[PDB]
Amino acid sequence: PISPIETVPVKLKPGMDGPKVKQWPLTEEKIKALVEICTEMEKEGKISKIGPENPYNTPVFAIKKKDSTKWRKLVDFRELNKRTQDFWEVQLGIPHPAGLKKKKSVTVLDVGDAYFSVPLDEDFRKYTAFTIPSINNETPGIRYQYNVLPQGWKGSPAIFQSSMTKILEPFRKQNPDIVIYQYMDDLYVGSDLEIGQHRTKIEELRQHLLRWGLTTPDKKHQKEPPFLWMGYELHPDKWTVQPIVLPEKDSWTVNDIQKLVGKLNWASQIYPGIKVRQLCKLLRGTKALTEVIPLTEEAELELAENREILKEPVHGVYYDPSKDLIAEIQKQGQGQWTYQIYQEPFKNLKTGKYARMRGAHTNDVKQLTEAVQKITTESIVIWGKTPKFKLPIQKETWETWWTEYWQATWIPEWEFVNTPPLVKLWYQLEKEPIVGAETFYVDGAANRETKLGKAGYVTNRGRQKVVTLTDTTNQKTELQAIYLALQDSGLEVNIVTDSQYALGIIQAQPDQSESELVNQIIEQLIKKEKVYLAWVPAHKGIGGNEQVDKLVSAGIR
Amino acid sequence: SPIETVPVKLKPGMDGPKVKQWPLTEEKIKALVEICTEMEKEGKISKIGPENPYNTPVFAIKKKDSTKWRKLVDFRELNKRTQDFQLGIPHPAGLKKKKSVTVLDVGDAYFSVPLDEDFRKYTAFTIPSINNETPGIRYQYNVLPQGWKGSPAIFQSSMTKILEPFRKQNPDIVIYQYMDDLYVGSDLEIGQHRTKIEELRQHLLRWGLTTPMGYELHPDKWTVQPIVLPEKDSWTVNDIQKLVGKLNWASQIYPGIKVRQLCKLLRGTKALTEVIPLTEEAELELAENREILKEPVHGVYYDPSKDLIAEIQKQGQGQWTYQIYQEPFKNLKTGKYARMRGAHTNDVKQLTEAVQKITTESIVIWGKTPKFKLPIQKETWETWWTEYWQATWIPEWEFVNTPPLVKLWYQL
């Protein structure tokens, strides 16, 4: 049918007019197919013959699908699409299974010949003009135009969507306690009614839809659980990921590892513990797709650990609006975090992992906070509420960090859970100068042209040292200088630098870095017992800084 | 009750806003549905089709001394693409000088004036759904919307009529309209002041807008807090070094600053804890600088063609410092914010309070909101700001990593 729904007024972009793309001359066979296909469509009101007036045209083509000798009509709307107004956006997200509420009875109903059952604005149909050419550019071809939403036109997905929303509204009002999910041409229905009433409510729905030009499958034609939906396997009381097969292979290509990471990231939605970090590392630099990449010892271990996890089929449970959501997080390793969300201890609605920030100098407290943030956002999206957190960090550790850090931070309601490895700060800078501790005045310089540099210090105990560095930057020398002072100092040290840069990094109590150097410094800071770090402006009559600036600057402009 | 609508126009070339809707909690979605289905019945808004490709974010807040959900539309994009907002509202310089200023929400007035038919499309917004089960509920405005700078610009004519009698009766009172609010300042005793506000609400009342003892500001008692120089008997190298740095920095703001005498003390590679007696000379320079720091800052002037910028630093102990300028260091205003009894455990809560306060002061002083540099993670701010937000407006903001020194320079 063709829905009796009011049409959506459509228009072309401001300073633009309809398409006028000439018809390619087509084969005798292809022309025959188009004629019959179009005759059928015309008989169903999907299209209509037009006069010679209409100056618009869009190319038409015909292709036959294999294992069958049945032709299909392809319209190239690339041009009309560039000229068609922008629309809304169908949806901002796809439902996640974990967010599906528990309902005793669920039915899937798909809207049949979807796009073709919806009318197109009459004032816009003129722009959908296409031409079946005559055997060898004889005379005018048979010219048609759409009356319904054309397959492959820009506004079809959105217009269909709206039409369905308008159609479902009255039924929604009269049945507030029934859930309907709109997805493309599909329609999922859930209720907490015992079959009997439910099949009745379904039937009533279909009748409401049919009364509006939309065909659906009848009972015996409806799909039955499991439902293979967008990568998922849906059962009435549990869900999981579509069967994942990890290819047993000798020699892996970039393409193979890429697909592997894909499946793994995908499986991470319900299978806890999946680690992908070591595989991603192999994908660095890549330069090719067919090039084989030898697996590191670490990747082989990671892959093996993943297989173990995937050997045992895991399932997710559905959402109960009456119960609280609980999210638990654990540290898997270097910048690796996993989490799980449940309502009833250990009956997971969903799983996930976190591994951001490319080592821009961070610590476990910052990372944990980031993971909490990410989980909080998805919870709001999926369930409309934030979960209660279970974190492997002491309230004391948390308060100490937050109160003293420069950035505002805030975790929703959480509870400590003794699940090692626990999160902690590995070292802490002193708040005031250490009495009876050697004072190192450090500094570093680097020539912009030659990239050559010097790093060193001078103490109050009269010590001195200056190292030469090659292929360096000002930043690197400043960090080198601090590293030097930490190496030659021992348990208690006062260090005075002129680098806001280094002060900034160290003050944030990092425990991980992409910089081999910063790691040296961290490793060294952990060994100390007491460390005080101060800053002074450079190029000033400031005793100490004024002097290291000499030996470090000499020979390096 | 339509009238002759004021034809609105986007900037040439500029196109309508297409800002994504951020996920909302079920609680807030429920509240917005209830509110919107009521505004629809009143004809203030109406459903729209997919042929409307525009979108503006929507949230739900609660003002202070208010336990009833309110709709807050974030028109920041549309506002930037509008102006028009052409015939602006002049900012009185007397406002910042009043003994007291009262803020009154007059947003309910805007729903009387119909919005230009050809502009409505640009006011589109979405009420999202949980787990994206349902497609969003889409609407647009038929009347002047709250939050859009175009509304007060258009409503000026009617606002001046409403306030004419009250103005002639109290020609010494200053009335400034900014977005959905009215700023009312007088030099009167607090008792008369409050009485005059009450009278003003009656005038507004006669025009259908119930304008509820609102927040009371005292711009007179606003004094730019200095940079602060210590006061100790004995000083260490560390303290002088900390002082040299601080002044070295401030010298970039106030030209009159000197540091040569103090720096003279810092010579040789001494231990940080060593005590150092200050020369009588350094004493003067020091005292002389403190005097300079007491007074404003010679040379900085508000430029109405340039944007206002505000930086905030977390000082700890519920304390926050901030600076307002158009060009770095050229501070037009500096201040402080201490957590009010309650937020004793929330950084985001305090920061949102501090932002609203600073924004309010900006409106009073310049009649403009500053662009904020927030010491927080975007996603965190994005996730929580609405939880404690109570203003009808929303300033522009960006996220930054506070330079550790800056905190000290302004530390108190």
Ligand SMILES: CCc1nn(CCO)c(CC)c1Oc1cc(C#N)cc(C#N)c1
């Ligand atoms: C109300 C819709 C619904 N709820 N539940 C939870 C049952 O307790 C399930 C699992 C079977 C549903 O079915 C879908 C089937 C398909 C398919 N095909 C897709 C979605 C979605 N979203 C949902």
